[PDB]
């Protein structure tokens, strides 16, 4: 996160760290949707152009984290994956269309003060909140500049009109994506950056006061560059696939 701020303790009890064993390092962000399900970007696990192909045996999930590099002794829980589910149609070939993956934890995690699931949007929620001008929240432990924080970073970003999103890149944009960030003439800034991927873009419902995951940090050309925006996987759009694998397995 560029132009972000340190999160407060328990600000994002759903934030998950994807961490590889050997060499031990931050892979990506993630989000707890249930006691045994973690949602991330597929590009975190599979990206052939970069020879990236992670099996479950390669990963560890860290929930309830605040410090980036520290082993938060009595706070965080470390989970082993049972099985990873990449959307069968994720397009790593062209534009990261359908950049979503589900990870089944080997054993359910106990909730606490620092570990709590975020809500998945329903049709009316998405309909209400997914509007240009509406700010969402991105959290992560990724680069600070296009340079690594000690603590979870946060920034609030406004959803941008589809046209403006389309017009800011040469990349082929789909319905399974949205963009967010400030416009050059808005005088505020910030964005996600390397290591932020798979992290949640969440909004708080004014109807019921709950936090819903509207998006997933997918991509963007550089970090916080003017006239450029961040692209997020649109969660509602891929909700039935998510529903499909949860109910199936």
């Amino acid at each position: 996160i560029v132009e972000g701020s340190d999160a407060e303790i328990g600000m994002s009890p759903w934030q998950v760290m994807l961490f590889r064993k050997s060499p031990q390092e931050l892979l990506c962000g993630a989000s707890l949707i249930s006691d045994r399900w973690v949602l991330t970007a597929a590009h975190c696990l599979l990206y052939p152009p970069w020879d990236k192909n992670f099996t479950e045996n390669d990963l560890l999930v860290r929930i309830g984290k605040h410090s980036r590099t520290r082993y938060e002794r009595n706070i965080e829980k470390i989970s082993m994956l049972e099985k990873i589910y990449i959307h069968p149609r994720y397009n790593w070939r062209e534009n990261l269309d359908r950049d979503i993956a589900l990870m089944k934890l080997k054993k359910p995690v106990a909730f606490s003060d620092y570990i709590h699931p975020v809500c998945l949007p329903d049709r009316e929620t998405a309909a209400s909140l997914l509007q240009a001008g509406y700010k969402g929240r991105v959290t992560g432990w990724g680069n600070l500049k296009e340079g690594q924080p000690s603590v979870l970073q946060v920034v609030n970003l406004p959803i941008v009109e589809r046209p403006v999103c389309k017009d800011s890149t040469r990349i082929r944009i789909t319905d399974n994506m949205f963009c967010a960030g400030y416009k050059p003439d808005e005088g505020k800034r910030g964005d996600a950056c390397e290591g932020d991927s798979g992290g949640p873009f969440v909004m708080k419902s004014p109807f019921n006061n709950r936090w819903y995951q509207m998006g997933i940090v997918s991509w963007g050309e550089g970090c916080d560059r003017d006239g450029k925006y961040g692209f997020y996987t649109h969660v509602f759009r891929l909700k039935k696939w998510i529903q499909k694998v949860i109910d199936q397995f």
């Binding site: 961490f19 060499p23 031990q24 390092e25 931050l26 560890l60 860290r62 980036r68 590099t69 520290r70 082993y71 470390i78 690594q148």
Partner: peptide
Amino acid sequence: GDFEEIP
């Protein structure tokens, strides 16, 4: 790396 070992 900059990482504190995990059990």
